[PDB]
């Protein structure tokens with residue numbers, strides 16, 4: 001038989017990284033979902049598009065919604 005050690009330290013950032021790319025890693029650049037419950041992390045150079053014409057300011061959108069939120073728009077009240 002084998003064993004398995006599990007138990008991280010409470011002194012670490014509980015990041016989610018619900019990015020689309022599929023990668024569950026973190027870097028020195030990410031956008032948090034406006035939603036309180038969601039508060040998911042999503043790489044900047046993944047969902048956010050490049051600013052060819054703008055090439056700068058304004059900076060990242062203060063009001064951004066992940067793929068889980070951006071998709072949830074319709075009421076679907078049945």
Ligand SMILES: [Zn+2]
Pocket residue numbers: 019020021022023042043046
């Ligand atoms: Zn990503």
Ligand SMILES: [Zn+2]
Pocket residue numbers: 033034035038039040065066067068069070
């Ligand atoms: Zn969200």
